[PDB]
Design a protein around this ligand. Structure first.
Ligand SMILES: CSc1nc(-c2ccnc(NC(C)=O)c2)c(-c2cccc(NC(=O)c3cccc4c3NC(=O)c3ccccc3N4)c2)[nH]1
Lengths: 291, 303
């Protein structure tokens, strides 16, 4: 309850737009704490359709759970303004991972890609441990805090609100959403990362996707992926939800691959491709990522 | 690895924030190599050094400034050794504590004031434990990360830059320095406790100027004659007594920072018994909701 700060329209303002969607619009904004002469940058999501006070009470009820996620790889809702639903969180200068890997296409070392896989599996394992089903995991829903530090956002938004190309078969046919359907989605998100942001099933129309999944077609092996990595993606997309890896197992498998990334990803340029470096990491961290 | 050497090409000064005797502070933007993002930072471009020092001696002293690891001391993050010496640190949008107590004059609750004394003493007690001496502690060299959280800054810069001889009579923080330091240029952890006493007096007077109307060149003499700063109106004698012990001529009789931490922590637990402030019961103490929001937004540091 003290993890979510209820804001009033007069103590913050939107300053510039960053991104949009069906959900709502994303703004860089400024928080002006009462009685102070400072303007603190925030990110703000304004939802598309406002609604009644009864719907606001439902949103606030869910916002109290979102405010309670404490994990380095999941975004925490910080504040809310009920006008008309504005969600406030920490501003990330880097935007979303999908855009990041498109902008940096073919310029990303194997070390980063697998660390992002690890971190996203950690974030999803956390949600599962908290009994939260995301229902829309995708590269567009992972935000970049620093190139070394990514965070899942917008878990539960699909519920309070249709990405068919990311959904488990059982979720298309029967609107069944579990943590194991989130594992199917995780697999599509790793595919996104490994193709530097390609659209999944980019020909196929969404209404025909369930058809080809039953025929046993799956997204193809991305050029840079060794068979080891494509094996893991293919398990994420088995028909029997319970045959799919657990998020805890994905952390372990991807963590082992990230101790030797050039073995599992074959990337032209990789040896001299930028990695972390303790000096830069301390720097990013001290400047803007002390968590 | 604790200190990033920067090239001039990867940052830019954007707006000046304020000027001191040691240099001017700018808000600037870092641009990491290979990225299209601008990361806000603070840049202090240093004034000319009197002691004329080699680029390497600087580096050896910047590495020590980069090693301070404490919630209540600012760490040097990076350095540019070009035509000037430019220090890069994390941007503190609130500015310094001196400006802040001036701006919120008579609008600050005793719980805040005493908590700031705790945190500053915790900051100095860490530097003592590392066997480091600040030399220029003052309200102007305490930064506000959040109203709940202050940090000592500019550590090391007094050693770094030195001072011409004429500056010792008119820079040299004469009115904050122990008598030994003014006379013999001794600097110890106990002369730091003198500056801390003055710093505390700055806070309790909401930023008044110490010994206002006395020329700095005569501070020497009045201290020997036994004049000290007067009791600020909001201080009970408990608080004033501690400040007076900090200014004893005998450096060994002044309190230790570790003792100051306990004493002020105790006063912090019953703050209306030790500071008398009109309307203190209507002063904002920060609710857990508010503190959590500051911390998650701007202050994710350890404690
Ligand atoms: C995908 S695009 C994007 N980018 C950003 C962003 C953020 C920071 N910096 C940047 N920087 C740059 C340069 O772009 C961008 C944001 C954003 C901005 C503000 C807030 C939020 N999220 C939340 O509040 C939130 C947090 C947790 C879970 C959910 C959340 N939301 C919901 O609606 C929701 C509603 C009901 C039930 C569940 C929900 N789920 C997301 N969105």
């Amino acid at each position: 309850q003290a993890l979510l700060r209820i804001l009033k329209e007069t103590e913050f303002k939107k300053i510039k737009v960053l991104g949009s969607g069906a959900f709502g619009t994303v703004y860089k904004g400024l928080w002006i704490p009462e009685g102070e002469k400072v303007k603190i940058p925030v990110a703000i999501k304004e939802l598309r359709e406002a609604t009644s006070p009864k719907a606001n009470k439902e949103i606030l009820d869910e916002a109290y759970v979102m405010a309670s996620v404490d994990n380095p790889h999941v975004c925490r809702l910080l504040g809310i303004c009920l006008t008309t639903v504005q969600l406030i969180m920490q501003l990330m200068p880097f935007g979303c991972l999908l855009d990041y890997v498109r902008e940096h296409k073919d310029n990303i070392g194997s070390q980063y890609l697998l660390n992002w896989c690890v971190q996203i599996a950690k974030g999803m394992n956390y949600l599962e441990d908290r009994r939260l089903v995301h229902r829309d995991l995708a590269a567009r829903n992972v935000l970049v805090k620093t190139p070394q530090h990514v965070k899942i956002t917008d878990f539960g938004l699909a519920k309070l609100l249709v990405p068919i190309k990311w959904m488990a078969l059982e979720s298309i046919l029967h609107r069944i959403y579990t943590h194991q359907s989130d594992v199917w989605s995780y697999g599509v998100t790793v595919w996104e990362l490994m193709t530097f942001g390609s659209k999944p099933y980019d020909g196929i129309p969404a209404s025909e996707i369930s058809s080809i999944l039953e025929k046993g077609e799956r997204l193809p092996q991305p050029p840079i992926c060794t068979i080891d990595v494509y094996m893991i993606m293919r398990k994420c997309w088995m028909i029997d939800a319970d045959s799919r890896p657990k998020f805890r197992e994905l952390i372990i498998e991807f963590s082992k691959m990230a101790r030797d990334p050039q073995r599992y990803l074959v990337i032209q340029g990789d040896e001299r491709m930028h990695l972390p470096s303790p000096t830069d990491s301390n720097f990013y961290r001290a400047l803007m990522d002390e968590e």
